Amino acid sequence: PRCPRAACQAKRGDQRCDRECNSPGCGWDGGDCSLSVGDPWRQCEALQCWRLFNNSRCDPACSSPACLYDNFDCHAGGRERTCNPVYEKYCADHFADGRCDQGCNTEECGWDGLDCASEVPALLARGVLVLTVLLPPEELLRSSADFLQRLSAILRTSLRFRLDAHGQAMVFPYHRPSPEVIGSVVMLEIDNRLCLQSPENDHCFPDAQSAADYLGALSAVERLDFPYPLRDVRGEPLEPP
Amino acid sequence: CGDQRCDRECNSPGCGWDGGDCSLSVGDPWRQCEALQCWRLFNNSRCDPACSSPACLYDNFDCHAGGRERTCNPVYEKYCADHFADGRCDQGCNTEECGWDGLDCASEVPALLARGVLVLTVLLPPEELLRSSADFLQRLSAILRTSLRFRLDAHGQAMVFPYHREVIGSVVMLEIDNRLCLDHCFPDAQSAADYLGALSAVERLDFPYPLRDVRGEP
Numbered sequence: 008p009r010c011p012r013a014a015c016q017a018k019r020g021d022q023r024c025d026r027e028c029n030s031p032g033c034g035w036d037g038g039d040c041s042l043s044v045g046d047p048w049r050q051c052e053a054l055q056c057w058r059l060f061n062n063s064r065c066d067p068a069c070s071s072p073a074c075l076y077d078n079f080d081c082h083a084g085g086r087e088r089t090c091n092p093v094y095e096k097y098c099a100d101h102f103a104d105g106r107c108d109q110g111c112n113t114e115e116c117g118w119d120g121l122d123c124a125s126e127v128p129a130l131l132a133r134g135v136l137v138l139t140v141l142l143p144p145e146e147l148l149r150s151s152a153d154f155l156q157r158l159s160a161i162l163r164t165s166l167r168f169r170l171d172a173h174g175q176a177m178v179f180p181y182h183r184p185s186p187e188v189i190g191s192v193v194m195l196e197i198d199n200r201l202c203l204q205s206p207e208n209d210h211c212f213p214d215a216q217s218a219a220d221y222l223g224a225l226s227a228v229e230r231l232d233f234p235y236p237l238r239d240v241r242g243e244p245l246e247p248p
Numbered sequence: 249c250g251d252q253r254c255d256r257e258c259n260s261p262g263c264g265w266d267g268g269d270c271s272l273s274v275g276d277p278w279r280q281c282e283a284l285q286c287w288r289l290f291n292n293s294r295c296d297p298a299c300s301s302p303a304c305l306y307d308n309f310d311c312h313a314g315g316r317e318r319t320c321n322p323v324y325e326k327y328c329a330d331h332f333a334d335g336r337c338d339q340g341c342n343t344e345e346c347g348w349d350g351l352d353c354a355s356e357v358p359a360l361l362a363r364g365v366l367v368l369t370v371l372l373p374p375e376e377l378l379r380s381s382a383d384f385l386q387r388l389s390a391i392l393r394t395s396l397r398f399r400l401d402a403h404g405q406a407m408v409f410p411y412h413r414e415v416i417g418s419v420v421m422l423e424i425d426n427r428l429c430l431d432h433c434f435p436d437a438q439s440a441a442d443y444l445g446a447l448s449a450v451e452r453l454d455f456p457y458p459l460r461d462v463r464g465e466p
């Protein structure tokens with residue numbers, strides 16, 4: 008039993024992050040603190056890396072994909088690490104409005120919702136990123152630009168709602184577990200069309216579950232800054248047509 | 249009630265705006281206006297067609313921009329200012345009320361300058377003034393609803409000269425590019441100076457710089 012605190016057993020999965028249980032040995036409070044991701048560092052080949060993820064400093068031995076790129080500490084420095092708080096509201100409002108805004112045309116601001124790269128062929132990561140957000144579908148879609156801009160900025164790549172055959176967003180109602188609609192189950196595409204080529208420069212997620220892990224890690228170390236009631240994240244495969 | 253100091257107690261049409269103190273040293277902004285009632289209709293945010301001529305300073309654009317298009321959205325203003333004339337197109341700032349993004353989006357359109365040069369005295373030393381050129385030019389462009397830029401010398405350097413009491417401010421020389429002005433544009437520098445003087449006279453001018461005076465020169 009890698010979880011030495013007894014009181015933690017009763018509290019894993021209760022839908023509440025319990026900070027006394029937020030450790031690898033306690034599975035990040037049974038996933039309550041890591042957006043349900045069991046172990047975000049499952050594939051990481053170096054044991055010290057989860058401890059160096061949150062330091063805003065490049066740790067080269069932790070910069071592999073499997074080690075979640077050291078929270079991009081080695082690929083983005085200085086002003087390029089965050090969208091300028093002063094420009095954020097503008098970028099959120101002009102995201103995917105069909106007109107190119109070069110000042111938002113960066114991976115840290117969300118690539119302007121691809122307004123500047125719309126003729127570049129889509130390059131989707133494998134699978135679908137599935138998010139549970141405690142906002143009903145109509146309310147969630149009412150601020151889809153802000154939601155997608157901020158989530159794109161966090162993942163430093165382009166995100167959008169996956170659409171069905173009739174052009175409708177794959178956003179489904181979420182019901183209170185064992186009734187009423189409490190939130191949304193959101194399905195997203197990850198478009199990596201603006202990613203870098205060289206092994207040293209590339210810092211995109213090749214599949215949905217990889218991006219989920221990174222988000223889970225941001226939550227585990229109290230670094231995720233996303234103004235939405237985000238409950239869980241995961242990657243799912245899709246069958247072929 | 250020529251003091252070189254704006255006194256609101258003396259700032260009235262009857263006293264020539266404190267001798268031009270409050271109208272940025274512009275003696276009479278309505279000098280060319282073919283109508284007498286216009287100074288009273290300039291500030292009402294309502295279209296008065298009889299004052300909508302250029303010489304009557306377009307009735308403060310009340311007939312050309314009355315709705316949401318009169319000012320750059322306060323929420324986006326800081327972004328537009330910082331990204332003005334940075335050589336990259338920002339379509340969200342690409343409007344006359346936001347300063348046309350410093351013409352970043354119209355590089356294929358031939359320059360079309362108004363007559364003369366707009367000369368401003370600003371109580372900021374040149375080095376400090378130049379440190380915020382984008383904000384200064386963007387805000388001034390938005391107000392004039394056209395494109396403004398520094399005049400360059402033979403070595404391509406901005407013509408911003410020290411202003412002495414030594415070094416109390418700057419004398420700035422600007423050009424007006426009307427290439428995107430398709431009546432609501434100023435044909436010459438003095439007209440734009442007059443309009444600015446008019447805004448100051450009626451306390452409508454909102455410009456976060458210690459702006460002393462304005463004038464047109466050929």
Ligand SMILES: *[C@@H]1O[C@H](CO)[C@@H](O[C@@H]2O[C@H](CO)[C@@H](O[C@H]3O[C@H](CO[C@H]4O[C@H](CO)[C@@H](O)[C@H](O)[C@@H]4O)[C@@H](O)[C@H](O)[C@@H]3O)[C@H](O)[C@H]2NC(C)=O)[C@H](O)[C@H]1NC(C)=O
Pocket residue numbers: 061063228229230231232
């Ligand atoms: C991983 O690194 C992060 C920094 O890169 C650490 O997050 C930062 O933590 C500090 C202190 O814990 C916090 O400072 C402010 O905290 C107080 C308010 O906290 C609330 O408000 C902020 C502002 O929106 C919010 O982000 C917090 O999550 C919380 O809701 C202030 O009263 C205090 O004076 C101080 O200014 C930073 O805000 C916070 N930064 C971010 C981006 O979250 C994080 O703690 C670390 N992980 C650890 C230590 O486990």
Ligand SMILES: *[C@@H]1O[C@H](CO)[C@@H](O)[C@H](O)[C@H]1NC(C)=O
Pocket residue numbers: 291449450451452
């Ligand atoms: C013109 O209108 C503005 C808008 O409130 C006002 O602040 C200003 O005092 C007015 N001008 C005069 C001369 O009253």
Ligand SMILES: [Ca+2]
Pocket residue numbers: 018019020021022023024025036039
């Ligand atoms: Ca818990």
Ligand SMILES: [Ca+2]
Pocket residue numbers: 059060061062063064065066077080
């Ligand atoms: Ca690090």
Ligand SMILES: [Ca+2]
Pocket residue numbers: 101102103104105106107108119122
């Ligand atoms: Ca855009």
Ligand SMILES: [Ca+2]
Pocket residue numbers: 250251252253254255258266269
């Ligand atoms: Ca006076």
Ligand SMILES: [Ca+2]
Pocket residue numbers: 289290291292293294295296307308310
């Ligand atoms: Ca009017």
Ligand SMILES: [Ca+2]
Pocket residue numbers: 331332333334335336337338349352
């Ligand atoms: Ca620009």
